[PDB]
Amino acid sequence: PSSRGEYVVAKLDDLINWARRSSLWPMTFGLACCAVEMMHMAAPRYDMDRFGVVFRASPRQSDVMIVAGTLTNKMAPALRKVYDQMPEPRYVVSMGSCANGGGYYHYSYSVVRGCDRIVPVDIYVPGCPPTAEALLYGILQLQKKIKREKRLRIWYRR
């Protein structure tokens, strides 16, 4: 057969992307209420595992961090610690108003006004709390975001 380098890189990129989105093992900070809706996303009706998303993942095997609740100033150092220990590729999902931008404690002295002040965020899931279905939509949006990555294709043209 005959094939260019550009074609080979495009197909290998699709393979690794398909594997990375098909097997997303999430770490979940269950900081507050939004953790309860994260638990409903694992329960029978939605069953995130059927997408390949394991119920429980350790911090140092995790692929995505889900920040489900209010990030207080006392807790912020610990969350950045966990984020650094995560091996790459690593993605953060910000779930709910509190994590997205402080929410209903935005004007508090003890609350970080959004977790994007601490860690980079890939997807923002609105709600207080987002419904289990709304979080599931967010995770499926992360899978499509990963599908569009072009790591190998960029590397070839460097």
Binding site: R80, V112, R113
Partner: protein, 210 residues
């Protein structure tokens, strides 16, 4: 109990019983009790001099006609106009007699308050909360230290003069590879509303003119 659908009925037998017990406590501990009042919705409060905490709390716990075995709560209120700005409130519960009672005292920034842990072990964390949020020091407390605020947090947030958003905010700095505190700057300032109406609502609470 009246045919007024929207008005809370009055229980007058409870009001009478709580007033009788207010005198009883005042008669027995006259050295310490400064005031006794029962509200319209039937809640007895005993105001005491800050030095009568342990004698007053002990008497209510152990007396055969008090038996307020349970400390339901312990908190402080900040009223900056008062000279003793902090008011310490004890809510107690009696299961033998199915009754509640409130004990109140006061202090300032620089007056310690005797710890009630000797009387109610429940007060250990309540007083740590009072110290942390209000900066009221309790003497003879087994382990007094912050319980809610972040380590190294300067100030006492629940004081009326502490600003709502505080003075410092945290972010992550790439250059120093850690979470750094910095002076607070809000993208949108909290908008203060003046909601009080200029017309009096409750004549029964009118205060005499200066």
């Amino acid at each position: 109990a009246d045919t007024r659908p929207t008005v809370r009925p009055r229980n007058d037998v409870a009001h009478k019983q709580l007033s009788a017990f207010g005198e009883y406590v005042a008669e027995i501990l006259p050295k310490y009790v400064q005031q006794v009042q029962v509200s319209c919705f039937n809640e007895l409060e005993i105001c005491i001099h800050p030095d009568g905490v342990i004698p007053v709390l002990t008497f209510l716990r152990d007396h055969s006609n008090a038996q307020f075995k349970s400390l339901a709560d312990l908190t402080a209120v900040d009223i900056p106009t008062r000279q003793n700005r902090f008011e310490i409130v004890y809510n107690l519960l009696s299961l033998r007699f199915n009754s509640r009672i409130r004990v109140k005292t006061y202090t300032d920034e620089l007056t310690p308050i005797e710890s009630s842990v000797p009387v109610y072990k429940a007060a250990n964390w309540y007083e740590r909360e009072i110290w942390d949020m209000f900066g009221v020091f309790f003497a003879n407390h087994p382990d007094l230290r912050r319980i809610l605020t972040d380590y190294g947090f300067e100030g006492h947030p629940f004081r009326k003069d502490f600003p709502l958003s505080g003075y410092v905010e945290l972010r992550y700095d790439d250059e120093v590879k850690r979470v750094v505190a910095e002076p607070v700057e809000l993208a949108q300032e909290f908008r203060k509303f003046d909601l009080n109406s200029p017309w009096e609502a409750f004549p029964a609470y009118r205060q005499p003119p200066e």
